[PDB]
Amino acid sequence: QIRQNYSTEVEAAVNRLVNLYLRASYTYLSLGFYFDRDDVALEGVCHFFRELAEEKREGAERLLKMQNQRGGRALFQDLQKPSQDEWGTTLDAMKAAIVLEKSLNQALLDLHALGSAQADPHLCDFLESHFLDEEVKLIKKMGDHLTNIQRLVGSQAGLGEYLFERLTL
Amino acid sequence: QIRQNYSTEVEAAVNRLVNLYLRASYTYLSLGFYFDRDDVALEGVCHFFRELAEEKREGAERLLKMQNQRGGRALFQDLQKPSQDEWGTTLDAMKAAIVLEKSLNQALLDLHALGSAQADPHLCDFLESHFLDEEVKLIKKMGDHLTNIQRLVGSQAGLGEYLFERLTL
Amino acid sequence: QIRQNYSTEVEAAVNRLVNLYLRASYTYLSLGFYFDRDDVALEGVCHFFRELAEEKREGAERLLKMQNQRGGRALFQDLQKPSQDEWGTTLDAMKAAIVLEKSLNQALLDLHALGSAQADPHLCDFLESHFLDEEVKLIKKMGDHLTNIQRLVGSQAGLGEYLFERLTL
Amino acid sequence: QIRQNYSTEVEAAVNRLVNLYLRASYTYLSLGFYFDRDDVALEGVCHFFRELAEEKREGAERLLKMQNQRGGRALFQDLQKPSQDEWGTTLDAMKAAIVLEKSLNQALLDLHALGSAQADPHLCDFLESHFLDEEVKLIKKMGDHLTNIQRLVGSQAGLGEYLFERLTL
Ligand SMILES: [Fe+3]
Ligand SMILES: [Fe+3]
Ligand SMILES: [Fe+3]
Ligand SMILES: [Fe+3]
Ligand SMILES: [Fe+3]
Ligand SMILES: [Fe+3]
Ligand SMILES: [Fe+3]
Ligand SMILES: [Fe+3]
Ligand SMILES: [Fe+3]
Ligand SMILES: [Fe+3]
Ligand SMILES: [Fe+3]
Ligand SMILES: [Fe+3]
Ligand SMILES: [Fe+3]
Ligand SMILES: [Fe+3]
Ligand SMILES: [Fe+3]
Ligand SMILES: [Fe+3]
Ligand SMILES: [Fe+3]
Ligand SMILES: [Fe+3]
Ligand SMILES: [Fe+3]
Ligand SMILES: [Fe+3]
Ligand SMILES: [Fe+3]
Ligand SMILES: [Fe+3]
Ligand SMILES: [Fe+3]
Ligand SMILES: [Fe+3]
Ligand SMILES: [Fe+3]
Ligand SMILES: [Fe+3]
Ligand SMILES: [Fe+3]
Ligand SMILES: [Fe+3]
Ligand SMILES: [Fe+3]
Ligand SMILES: [Fe+3]
Ligand SMILES: [Fe+3]
Ligand SMILES: [Fe+3]
Ligand SMILES: [Fe+3]
Ligand SMILES: [Fe+3]
Ligand SMILES: [Fe+3]
Ligand SMILES: [Fe+3]
Ligand SMILES: [Fe+3]
Ligand SMILES: [Fe+3]
Ligand SMILES: [Fe+3]
Ligand SMILES: [Fe+3]
Ligand SMILES: [Fe+3]
Ligand SMILES: [Fe+3]
Ligand SMILES: [Fe+3]
Ligand SMILES: [Fe+3]
Ligand SMILES: [Fe+3]
Ligand SMILES: [Fe+3]
Ligand SMILES: [Fe+3]
Ligand SMILES: [Fe+3]
Ligand SMILES: [Fe+3]
Ligand SMILES: [Fe+3]
Ligand SMILES: [Fe+3]
Ligand SMILES: [Fe+3]
Ligand SMILES: [Fe+3]
Ligand SMILES: [Fe+3]
Ligand SMILES: [Fe+3]
Ligand SMILES: [Fe+3]
Ligand SMILES: [Fe+3]
Ligand SMILES: [O]
Ligand SMILES: [O]
Ligand SMILES: [O]
Ligand SMILES: [O]
Ligand SMILES: [O]
Ligand SMILES: [O]
Ligand SMILES: [O]
Ligand SMILES: [O]
Ligand SMILES: [O]
Ligand SMILES: [O]
Ligand SMILES: [O]
Ligand SMILES: [O]
Ligand SMILES: [O]
Ligand SMILES: [O]
Ligand SMILES: [O]
Ligand SMILES: [O]
């Protein structure tokens, strides 16, 4: 058929990466609606996490498209529900979001390493152009938010959270 | 004449609901001008309650229009003055506004229940399309405001009230 | 808080309905990418199921928004993977899609019935306006497709599938 | 001069790759004019292969430009005539086109592997951005066409070929 220089190991890892992205998307949808509760009511934080949900979903779809293009076979698994039902403060949420992005990034780097080992340049390029740079920029942005949240919730935690949501997000 | 499947019980309840809406409107006009006093001076809160006064007045007029369309007879009663002359802080005001909206909502649901009992689908539809959804959205919005006010007036009550009026309203 | 006339039974059912919609969306994403395989290659069928994936996701998000507005608490569960990994012919796929939509519709009607029992008109209206009509139109459309597929794959199954994808989808 | 980190092995391989691309272009020009014969008369297939002829020629010219930029020396060889004078059916032609693209892709991957061995990142990047992704997409597209042709020429080969040329190409 069309399949060429595309190892079963890469195929399998691509499928696992699809699962991680759809799970991240699901986590971010839960984060977003949490911040939209009447007893939380931080619209800007809700909007930030809903954007991220969409981004992660796009990520998965690009992976799935790439899987088809290489002649791999997509295989879907159960999507585990997010690790929490309530996400605490903006501070807690942004910490959990960075932890999540780091673990996506690590999976991207593992796939890239596998790609190199197998001499699969097309895999490596595709991750490079579409995933690795974006993750880096996103993680930088989240780190910056985290610094600003922390500096604001020194004293006057409630005031700090409100001001962050209003003037940054 | 035109009157068809429109019970005297519904007619009476519609008239009482008109009275509740005009009273709410009157309450909100008093809330608005309170916040416009030189010793209160929270323009954004004044503007929020003046919008609500207009909305409640529209509500009443739609009810009165519906009463005519069904061939009921409008009957006006005295409008009781608002329960307070001074409304305290933004926090106090938003609490009183939610209490008021809840009691409008309860009257809307009672009318709907009566409408069902009497097999009056047109009444039920009219409340559905024009009143029940709006009340839900409005009460959600007021709950959100209340959360933000409370989080801001933890410490530094005056600063918190100012920031809310400036950055939310 | 804001919660008013919103029973724990309705809250629970809304959460289950969110799960069904996200599962449908996941099924449709798997259907779409299946038809985009190089050994299936029916772009119009891929595009039809990818539209449906997006629609089901929107459905879930509206439900989640409604849950917040009523003061319910969203709770996420694990999303079960689609019931199949390969979906056979366009005929097989459209049959499975109708079965799925019927089961969403049945859940919508069950929720509506619960809504009535609990005298929760806002729930009933929300399902009415946003879900019940769309499901009906969608199921009609899928039935129509099914008739056309069947009439085409009488003899010359491959020719019939190609012509359907090209001239209908 | 300008030449830096550009091995004679890479230079030689680039020259061979130019020859393969110009040969592919020549093959596609022969495929195109075949389908434009009065006794074949499949304009859409002619147009598809004439586009590919132009694409392969562009490919060669980019390679030759890159050779100059690195300070390599272009060397031209004889271009072998296409392996066939007549190309059979659309099915036969699309099979031969996929075989050809696979062999271009393999040469691109070999050059990339050489590029890595020699620590020549600029070579690797240039193939990545300009060649490897396009080949993958093209081979996917040709596989898809092949599936559709095959499904159509089950029974009624002539009808199937006509419909493919009219509704796909
Ligand atoms: Fe909102
Ligand atoms: Fe808003
Ligand atoms: Fe908004
Ligand atoms: Fe967006
Ligand atoms: Fe968006
Ligand atoms: Fe957006
Ligand atoms: Fe987008
Ligand atoms: Fe986006
Ligand atoms: Fe995006
Ligand atoms: Fe992006
Ligand atoms: Fe993007
Ligand atoms: Fe499979
Ligand atoms: Fe919880
Ligand atoms: Fe590379
Ligand atoms: Fe003023
Ligand atoms: Fe002013
Ligand atoms: Fe002004
Ligand atoms: Fe206005
Ligand atoms: Fe106005
Ligand atoms: Fe105005
Ligand atoms: Fe108005
Ligand atoms: Fe208005
Ligand atoms: Fe209005
Ligand atoms: Fe309105
Ligand atoms: Fe209006
Ligand atoms: Fe007084
Ligand atoms: Fe006074
Ligand atoms: Fe009804
Ligand atoms: Fe496509
Ligand atoms: Fe296409
Ligand atoms: Fe397309
Ligand atoms: Fe769409
Ligand atoms: Fe879309
Ligand atoms: Fe679209
Ligand atoms: Fe949409
Ligand atoms: Fe859509
Ligand atoms: Fe939509
Ligand atoms: Fe829709
Ligand atoms: Fe819509
Ligand atoms: Fe909860
Ligand atoms: Fe399978
Ligand atoms: Fe109803
Ligand atoms: Fe011509
Ligand atoms: Fe012509
Ligand atoms: Fe022409
Ligand atoms: Fe061209
Ligand atoms: Fe041209
Ligand atoms: Fe052209
Ligand atoms: Fe061109
Ligand atoms: Fe071109
Ligand atoms: Fe081109
Ligand atoms: Fe190109
Ligand atoms: Fe180009
Ligand atoms: Fe010959
Ligand atoms: Fe000849
Ligand atoms: Fe590289
Ligand atoms: Fe690279
Ligand atoms: O909002
Ligand atoms: O968005
Ligand atoms: O993106
Ligand atoms: O996006
Ligand atoms: O003002
Ligand atoms: O207004
Ligand atoms: O309104
Ligand atoms: O209004
Ligand atoms: O496509
Ligand atoms: O779409
Ligand atoms: O929709
Ligand atoms: O949509
Ligand atoms: O032509
Ligand atoms: O062209
Ligand atoms: O190109
Ligand atoms: O081109």
Curated annotation (Swiss-Prot), chains A, B, C, D:
Q: Which Pfam families match?
A: Ferritin (PF00210)
Q: Which InterPro entries match?
A: Ferritin, Ferritin-like, Ferritin-like_diiron, Ferritin-like_SF, Ferritin_CS, Ferritin_DPS_dom
Q: Where is this region: Catalytic site for iron oxidation?
A: 51-58
Q: Which GO terms describe its cellular component?
A: autolysosome; autophagosome; cytoplasm; cytoplasmic vesicle; ferritin complex
| Keyword entries, A-Z | Acetylation, Cytoplasm, Cytoplasmic vesicle, Iron, Iron storage, Lysosome, Metal-binding
Spell out the coiled coil positions from the record: none
Q: Which SUPFAM superfamilies match?
A: Ferritin-like
Q: Where in the cell is it found?
A: Cytoplasmic vesicle, Autophagosome; Cytoplasm; Autolysosome
Q: Give the main location.
A: cytoplasm
The record's GO molecular-function terms, alphabetically, read: ferric iron binding; ferrous iron binding; iron ion binding
Looking at the record, the residues that make up the Ferritin-like diiron domain are: 4-153
CDD domains in the cross-refs: Ferritin
One biological process term from GO is: iron ion transport
- Binding site residues for Fe cation: E51, E54, E55, E58, E61
Which family does the record claim for this protein? Belongs to the ferritin family.
Q: Its quaternary structure?
A: Oligomer of 24 subunits. There are two types of subunits: L (light) chain and H (heavy) chain. The major chain can be light or heavy, depending on the species and tissue type. The functional molecule forms a roughly spherical shell with a diameter of 12 nm and contains a central cavity into which the insoluble mineral iron core is deposited. Interacts with NCOA4.
Question: What other comment is given for this protein?
Answer: In horse spleen the light chain is the major chain.
What's its job? Stores iron in a soluble, non-toxic, readily available form. Important for iron homeostasis. Iron is taken up in the ferrous form and deposited as ferric hydroxides after oxidation. Also plays a role in delivery of iron to cells. Mediates iron uptake in capsule cells of the developing kidney. Delivery to lysosomes by the cargo receptor NCOA4 for autophagic degradation and release or iron.
What name goes with this protein?
Answer: Ferritin light chain
Q: What is the protein's species of origin?
A: Equus caballus (Horse)
Organism lineage string = Eukaryota, Metazoa, Chordata, Craniata, Vertebrata
Gene of origin?
Answer: FTL
